[PDB]
Amino acid sequence: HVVIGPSSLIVHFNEVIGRGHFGCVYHGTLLKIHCAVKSLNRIEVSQFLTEGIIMKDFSHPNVLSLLGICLRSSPLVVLPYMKHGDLRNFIRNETHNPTVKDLIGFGLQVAKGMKYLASKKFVHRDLAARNCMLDEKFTVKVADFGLARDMYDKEYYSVHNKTGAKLPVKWMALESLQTQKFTTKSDVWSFGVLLWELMTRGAPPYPDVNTFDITVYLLQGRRLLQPEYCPDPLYEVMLKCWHPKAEMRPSFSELVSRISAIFSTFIG
Ligand SMILES: C[C@@H](c1ccc2nccn2c1)n1nnc2ncc(-c3cnn(C)c3)nc21
């Protein structure tokens, strides 16, 4: 059910709608549904289809789904069209003016998406507002995973010298920075940074810090500041997300409960 016949898909290669390190994203027509088509030519087949099957089994309103894969004599990843693009660029856009309730709602949507993924035992490893997207109905979808996974904004990835890996250090949990071990509990840390990103309308975290300098920074007893219009219990939620002990951080289930409680207190 993952494979799409070439006959069924029209790829508008002339107009590029996204740029990733592994390949570009183009406007697409799947037969008459509108879609986004990610190419991989900018870079195992058995693990590729396996990744596709897993991604298709994921069905939740706040998780970017897989429409399918097209095989051309590099394979094309077919994803639903996201009218408002990535969450970070949206909240950064001057033409849009989301309220504080709106921003909390966008965070609650990510938590709902992540609660779903964590229950399937799927660890994202690169959660950040730049890696979530919005469709026409303003539905946030946890994206940039499985076959859609890439480096969409290279500015926020530092290369480890002893490993050679591109790491999103300003979103990484303390243990991931020291041991390169990622779990659901480290995705929870990254969720706290996403919460901060939303409440500041896409400001870059720790502007005063330079790459792997971040580890000593956090070990000095430092955390991101409370943004101006961020409610006190929302900042309390973030602080819990950045707990030094992973096992002391809230689950995404707890996060859905606490954020929806904060969200219900706003009129509009
Ligand atoms: C494959 C790509 C994607 C998916 C759907 C879509 N509709 C319109 C454009 N689209 C791009 N994609 N999938 N997950 C992503 N996460 C993030 C980004 C992205 C692109 N630019 N920036 C800054 C982030 N792109 C992502």
Is 198 in contact with 103 (CB distance < 8 Å)? yes
Among 81, 108, 142, where does a domain finish?
81
Regarding whether 58 and 141 lie in a shared domain, the answer is no
Regarding whether 176 and 92 lie in a shared domain, the answer is yes
User: How far is Cα of residue 132 from the mean position of the Cα atoms in its chain?
Assistant: 4
Question: Where are any strands of DSSP class E within 129-240?
Answer: 132-134, 140-142, 158-159, 166-167
> Å resolution of this model?
2.5
Q: Which residue has tokens 């002339």?
A: 14
User: H or E segment at 70?
Assistant: strand 68-70
**Size (the chain), residues:** 268
Burial 67-86 (b: 16+ CB within 10 A, else e): bbbbeeeebbbbbbbbebbb
Q: Which residue has tokens 């509990």?
A: 185
Q: Determination technique for this PDB entry?
A: X-ray
DSSP character for 115? H
Regarding whether 170 and 152 lie in a shared domain, the answer is yes
Q: Is the CB of 81 under 6 A from ligand 1?
A: yes
Atom of ligand 1 nearest to the CA of 130: 24
Among 81, 115, 134, where does a domain finish?
81
DSSP secondary structure, 27-58, as one string = EEEE--EEEEEE--TT--HHHHHHHHHHHHS-
Regarding whether 135 and 10 lie in a shared domain, the answer is no
Handedness of CA 88, 91, 92, 95 (dihedral sign): positive
Domain hosting 226: range is 82-268
Regarding whether 26 and 128 lie in a shared domain, the answer is no
Q: Is the CB of 144 under 6 A from ligand 1?
A: yes
Rounded Cα distance between 253 and 60, Å, is 15
Which pair of structure tokens corresponds to residue 185?
Answer: 């509990």
HSE-up of residue 264 (Cα within 13 Å, Cβ side): 6
Q: Which of 57, 86, 102, 126 is catalytic?
A: 126
